């Protein structure tokens, strides 16, 4: 059971990474005054990308 | 209001917030609440590493805004208070002009177009230079001199 | 019984090979956001 | 008989469809007829995406065709209702010149070259932000505000 419990601690922190990589989407483009980097989207595509 | 936009809390201007290309635009070290219940009810993103909170413009006030440029000759700028010196890479301002609670005025071209948003400044006796946040081809980049003080 | 000398550290059949193979961690998708951190970070934290 | 050409649908005045280069061009969610026999019969190509009904110009409509540029400096344009605004990679003009049943209408430069066609435009106040498409570094592009209405 607590095998179960570290591997669920182990999707646990990569959730963690996940939300902190989406956070860390978002904090280079908050929606700068540009509004418009097809070179960062278009590389990074990890969620919401359609705004330009 | 030709430029003018602002974020009041209890009477009392706690800097100035502004909507700017397709961002509404706070400096997140001010403490409080937008003075307009409409935009306070917007979803608002906060970042401390940056002192930056953003939100997206609603569509019928989208013609208010002001317009951008990433690029930054040297020269004189306009702002809130009269005109301020760039050159060398370094913004400029009389001493006194600005203190705490001026965080948020827009620093705008001989076309109105803004360059910059101030947050902040370093008095040097005779000179201010102003401690700032900005964007520049698409990136943004907060640039502070030693010795700053938060406004 | 005479053969009663057992523990916990107990090799078996498939089994070790099965804990083997649960054991695809999570490390290198952590090294990843990592690096997202770090090249977040030297954007102006050549300093301190 | 400038830059625009009727069409019309079971009386009442339904867009308009364009001349430029070799093509024809027409807004998909336009219904009826080109007001021209000839041009109603042609092969017609469907584009959902960009709202584009496209045809084969005929050889004997040499002297309605218009003359193109891929390239929109910023700037103020003209179309048949006056003045419209490019800056920002926006098109805007005066709320209530443009409404429903003005879709299709061509927007050209100071030189007369057509650049772009009228899909739409959202209401934004003051001045309306236009949808379009059109064609940068001669590939098709839309661009548009958001929450736009076809007109």
């Not at chain 2, 990433?70 to 306009?78: A, C, W």
């Not at chain 2, 360059?115 to 640039?143: F, H, M, P, Y």
Request: aromatic share 8%.
């Amino acid at each position: 059971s607590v095998a179960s419990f570290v591997l669920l601690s182990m999707v646990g922190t990569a959730v963690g990474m996940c939300v902190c990589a989406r956070r860390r989407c978002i904090t280079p483009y908050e929606l700068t005054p540009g509004a418009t980097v097809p070179f960062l989207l278009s590389l990074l595509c990890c969620v919401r990308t359609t705004k330009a | 209001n030709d430029c003018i936009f602002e974020v009041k809390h209890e009477g009392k201007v706690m800097g100035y917030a502004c909507l700017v290309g397709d961002k509404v635009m706070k400096p997140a070290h001010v403490k409080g609440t937008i003075d307009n219940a409409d935009l306070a009810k917007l979803a608002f993103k906060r970042s401390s590493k940056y002192d930056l909170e953003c939100a997206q413009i609603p569509v019928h006030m989208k013609s208010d805004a002001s317009k951008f440029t990433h690029e930054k000759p040297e020269g004189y700028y306009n702002w809130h208070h009269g005109a301020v010196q760039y050159s060398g890479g370094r913004f400029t301002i009389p001493t006194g002009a600005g203190k705490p609670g001026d965080s948020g005025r827009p620093i705008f071209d001989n076309k109105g177009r803004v360059v910059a948003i101030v947050l902040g400044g370093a008095n040097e006796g005779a000179r201010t230079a102003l401690s700032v946040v900005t964007w520049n081809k698409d990136i943004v980049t907060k640039i502070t001199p030693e010795g700053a003080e938060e406004w | 019984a005479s053969h009663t000398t057992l523990g916990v550290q107990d090799i078996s059949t498939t089994a070790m090979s099965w804990v083997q193979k649960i054991t695809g961690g999570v490390g290198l998708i952590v090294a990843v956001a990592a690096l997202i951190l770090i090249v977040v970070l030297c954007v102006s934290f050549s300093r301190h």
